[PDB]
Amino acid sequence: AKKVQAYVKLQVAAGMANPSPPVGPALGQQGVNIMEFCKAFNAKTDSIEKGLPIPVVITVYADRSFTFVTKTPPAAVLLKKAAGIKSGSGKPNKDKVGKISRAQLQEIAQTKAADMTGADIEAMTRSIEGTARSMGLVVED
Template identity: 60%
Template sequence: SATPSPPIGPALGQRGVNIMGFVKEFNARTEKEVKGTPLPTVITVYQDKSFTFITKTPPATHFIKQAAGITSASKLPGREVAGKITRVQLREIAEKKMKDLNANDLDAATKIIEGSARAMGLNVVDA
């Protein structure tokens, strides 16, 4: 849920956008999302101070942390293991993220998500 407090309020206010209008519209459009889920949003502000916005899927790291049952990634990836995640879980995450990833097919998307998981210090297991 969006609030008029920083960082949203100041960013929109300096462009002359009706902050409460944005907050109400954003919250109405995202009410089905789980509270606390980060939603990357691209806001376009026009010269007449009107705006449009597009919400994207939550970051891959959010889904990876949920699937692996961890709260934060490894501070030393490659040396310190933060947890493990299965290839099936990676494929499910890739299916959710497919429209936001620069991948031609699901296998390529799964490899992208797998790379993110490894960079977070997770071991990828088959089962």
């Protein structure tokens, strides 16, 4: 949409109301009331069981305005939400633990298909196979 003024996509798990210090600056860019971004998203945050980093983007406007785009959580954390542990990448090509087939990957891609125009089904399938091999995970169908 917009241009060289501001465009950063950063939001982490929305159970924490206070802007986490490293996220702070993406809210510390164009003069927000930080209570506004706390009161914008919580009307829909009560339709979730919190625990995963959900992303939003920030985008700005002239006087004191701003805007933001809501999407669904990415499949990268959805790989390690089902797998139990949040960080598995210790050795990529030397660990063979943990299987999920393609059927789980497409049903977490329909929620991408019902939300976004990129991150398409069949193209991300090798990169949701590619985030498996870097973590040291296996896949069979």
